Design a protein around this nucleic acid. Structure first.
Ligand SMILES: *OCCCN1/C(=C/C=C/C=C/C2=[N+](CCCO)c3ccccc3C2(C)C)C(C)(C)c2ccccc21
Ligand SMILES: [Mg+2]
Ligand SMILES: [Mg+2]
Ligand SMILES: [Mg+2]
Ligand SMILES: [Mg+2]
Length: 760
DNA sequence: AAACGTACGCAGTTCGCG
DNA sequence: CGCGAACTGCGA
């Protein structure tokens, strides 16, 4: 099993390191024969001798062309003749590529910015994470001493916990009487003890939750202050911080640092992504959270540290269990993309596509297009195109609703209509498909590059969807459901890649052709179900719609829906397939992107509602949730109205706990870059002026008090709320929080109650 | 050096124009 | 003051 690859430099020459696990043993395979290269398209063959003499410099090293070789390749399927330029070191290429491209006889250069380690795995046909080798894993977490206004890692680390199959333990330098706690005397001794534990256990995988941003950076800073060599790497190196765009990540040489946060963030849909919320969503069990202030109080007074040590232990325990569950999913994606799990688990879906395209292009001797330069990138950013079809929803509380959607609308269109940059407006093409409205022609004579790849990806998803249905175990079934959804989004991300400005295989004509065909197909299914089966489509968005037969009972709606599915699937061509998603006994559709339905098990699913979003207080979400249940489950409009009257009366009489009035909103930039100052920005600016560290990602938790001025003038951070001096704004939480969250819902059901609120 | 990206859509807060 | 634009943030 190949775990990872990188390169080092020995005496000026690059040495590829292949990190492997074979027969239960970690091994490093070295390759000193791999030469970096890129391609040059020349105006005339005779200029190659002048191109060979181009030189450059980098860090005191004179860069020259080592060897050139003429090769026959394809570019978007058409034969091309380019020169392969070899170099000694991969760092030579960035230093010299601009001067080579600037030569008057050089038309363009290609494949000049592919990282040396990824170039090696592609050109050698090597796939990570293959085989039956069992990987050893170890999760860890830290607890720190925090005080408001201090620099990052100004206070010491208090606890370091870890967990594997042998259990979970905590290392700390204060006496805590728990059997899983190991006590040392100083923070330095605890760090060095943790370093020892990792050395003796020698795990292949280090699991964290947000270790890319907090744990490793905190450990790093503390190790510099204490003079500790944090030699976590299998080659004796320290963890290395890396940067991708605006995100940071930490690698440990010879191992796989598996940070679960970017994995869970795009695998599960949750309102918040705390470790406690993630563990509860996956395993169905709650996890207690102990906050930084209680940790500091327990450590500094010495009272109540067992609770802190239990929280620290459970942090490591649930991180190991989560990592164990999600490793197989990310291992498969690593095999599918063809890049190490460290990169695949963190990289954007654009690179998940492009890294695979680069590998398949190499297998087919297809020259890769370049990432755009500054002018082309800006031009792609400005241009846009039409997207999915969204229908204005029908008002009212409807009954006996079916939701029908396409299995994989955009990948199906790409394959069926052969939508690819190498098939667009192809000369001398015999048979082609013309996209509606946008009019682009896609050749059908030969399968396009990208269409020829999506079919296998879709089948991999159907394989997981089959194993999911055949698995009775609820946890294993849920994990497979997470897995098949990741593959579905990855495949559909091929359409978005077509419109992504940084894409090598960018194709705006391809992107708007896919959406145009998508709009045509959903409008076709909508027209057919209404005309031929007497259905009424209530709401539709991009690849699915809600429909019913007005006045019919549940059995008739169900029976006629399957009949229509047989009818429409016979008509729909290629890979397009409409599916029976589910039946719902009641539902309403507030606006576009806003709806709520309930199945025959009384389970309420919603879309785009306030119960999920940030910026809404608990009293508003709770009241909305109770109104949803009263309308959907009980069908009782008078009960829903009664609930609103009771909640607004409780607010007017100050009987609602102020904890239910906290509003959480995230700061997304430096406070200087805000052009308008709203409630959460005004609070953040007031906090920062007092020494509180405000950074992008900081969540502001405020409450609106009775006072004067704008809402921002009345809002204060909830951590400073004192019920002895502060009285909250009851009129605000009624008129701006509770009422907007229920009034649109009740109106969408056809009930515009004048005096919903208590008194006024 | 490497780059978290597709269109469509709602809605709260703020504040000058007419 | 009604209205709407600008800003802001998030949600197939
Ligand atoms: O390499 C040839 C081009 C040189 N060049 C520039 C290079 C910038 C490199 C960025 C390095 C970097 N890393 C390491 C990359 C892997 O993450 C890193 C890791 C972690 C945190 C931060 C960082 C950074 C910040 C920056 C610059 C210097 C930009 C430049 C300017 C003009 C011409 C050539 C180059
Ligand atoms: Mg790497
Ligand atoms: Mg664009
Ligand atoms: Mg069909
Ligand atoms: Mg006027």
């Amino acid at each position: 099993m190949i775990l990872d690859t990188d390169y080092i430099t020995e005496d000026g020459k690059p040495v590829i390191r292949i990190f492997k696990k074979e027969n239960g043993e970690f091994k490093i395979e070295y390759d000193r024969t791999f030469e970096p290269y890129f391609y040059a398209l020349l105006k005339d063959d005779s200029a190659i001798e002048e191109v060979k003499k181009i030189t450059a410099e980098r860090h005191g090293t004179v860069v020259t062309v080592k060897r050139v070789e003429k090769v026959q390749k394809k570019f978007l399927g058409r034969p091309v003749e380019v020169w392969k330029l070899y170099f000694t070191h991969p760092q030579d290429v960035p230093a010299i590529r601009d001067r080579i491209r600037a030569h008057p006889a050089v038309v363009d250069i290609y494949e000049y910015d592919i990282p040396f380690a990824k170039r090696y795995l592609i050109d050698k046909g090597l796939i990570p994470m293959e085989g039956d080798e069992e990987l050893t894993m170890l999760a860890f977490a830290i607890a720190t001493l925090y005080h408001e206004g201090e620099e990052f890692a100004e206070g010491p680390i208090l606890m370091i916990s870890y967990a594997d199959e042998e259990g979970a333990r905590v290392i700390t330098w204060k006496n805590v009487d728990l059997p899983y706690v190991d006590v040392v005397s100083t923070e330095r001794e605890m760090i060095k003890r943790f370093l020892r534990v990792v050395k003796e256990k020698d795990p292949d995988v280090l699991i964290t939750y947000n270790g890319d941003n907090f744990d490793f950076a905190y450990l790093k800073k503390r190790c510099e202050k204490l003079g500790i060599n944090f030699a976590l790497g299998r080659d004796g190196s320290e963890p290395k911080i890396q940067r991708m765009g605006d995100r940071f990540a930490v690698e440990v040489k010879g191992r796989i640092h598996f940070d679960l946060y970017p994995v869970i963030r795009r695998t599960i849909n949750l309102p918040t992504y705390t470790l406690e919320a993630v563990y509860e969503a996956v395993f169905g069990k709650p996890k207690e959270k102990v906050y930084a202030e209680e940790i500091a109080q327990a450590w500094e007074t010495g009272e109540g540290l067992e609770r802190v040590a239990r929280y620290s232990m459970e942090d490591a325990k649930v991180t190991y269990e989560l990592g164990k569950e999600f490793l197989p999913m990310e291992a498969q994606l690593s095999r599918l993309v063809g890049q190490p799990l460290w990169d695949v688990s963190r990289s954007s879906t654009g690179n998940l596509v492009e890294w695979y395209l680069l590998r398949k292009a190499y297998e087919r001797n297809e020259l890769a297009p370049n990432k755009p330069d500054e002018r082309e990138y800006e031009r792609r950013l400005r241009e846009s195109y039409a997207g999915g079809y969204v229908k204005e929803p029908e008002k009212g509380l409807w009954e006996n609703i079916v939701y029908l959607d396409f299995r994989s609308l955009y990948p199906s269109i790409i394959i069926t209509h052969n939508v690819s940059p190498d098939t667009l407006n192809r000369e001398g093409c015999k048979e082609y498909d013309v996209a509606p409205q946008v009019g682009h022609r896609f050749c059908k004579d030969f399968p396009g590059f990208i269409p020829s790849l999506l079919g296998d990806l879709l089948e991999e998803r159907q394989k997981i969807k089959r194993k999911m249905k055949a698995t009775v175990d609820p946890l294993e079934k849920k994990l497979l459901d997470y897995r098949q959804r990741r593959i579905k989004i990855l495949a559909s991300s091929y359409y978005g890649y077509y419109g992504y400005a940084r894409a090598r295989w960018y194709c705006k004509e391809c992107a708007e052709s896919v959406t145009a065909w998508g709009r045509q197909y959903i409008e076709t299914t909508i027209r057919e179900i209404e005309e031929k089966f007497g259905f009424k489509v209530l709401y539709a968005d991009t690849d699915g719609f809600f429909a019913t037969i007005p006045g019919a009972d549940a059995e008739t709606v169900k029976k006629k829906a399957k009949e229509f599915l047989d009818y429409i699937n016979a008509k729909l061509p290629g890979l397009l397939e409409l599916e029976y998603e589910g039946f719902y006994k009641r539902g309403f559709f507030v606006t576009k992107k806003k709806y709520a339905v309930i199945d025959e098990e009384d389970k309420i699913t919603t879309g785009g509602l306030e119960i999920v979003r940030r910026g809404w207080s608990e009293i508003a979400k709770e009241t909305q949730a109770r109104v949803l249940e009263a309308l959907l489950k009980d069908g009782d409009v008078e009960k829903a109205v009664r609930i609103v009257k009771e909640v607004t009366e409780k607010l007017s009489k100050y009987e609602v706990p102020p904890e239910k009035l906290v509003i959480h909103e995230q700061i997304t930039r430096d406070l200087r870059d805000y052009k308008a100052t709203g409630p959460h920005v005004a609070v953040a600016k007031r906090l920062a002026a007092r020494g509180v560290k405000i950074r992008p990602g900081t969540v502001i938790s405020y409450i609106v008090l009775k006072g004067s001025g704008r809402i921002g003038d009345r809002a204060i951070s909830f951590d400073e709320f004192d019920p002895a001096k502060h009285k909250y704004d009851a009129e605000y939480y009624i008129e701006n929080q509770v009422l907007p969250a229920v009034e649109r819902i009740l109106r969408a059901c056809g009930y515009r109650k004048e005096d919903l609120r208590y008194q006024k």
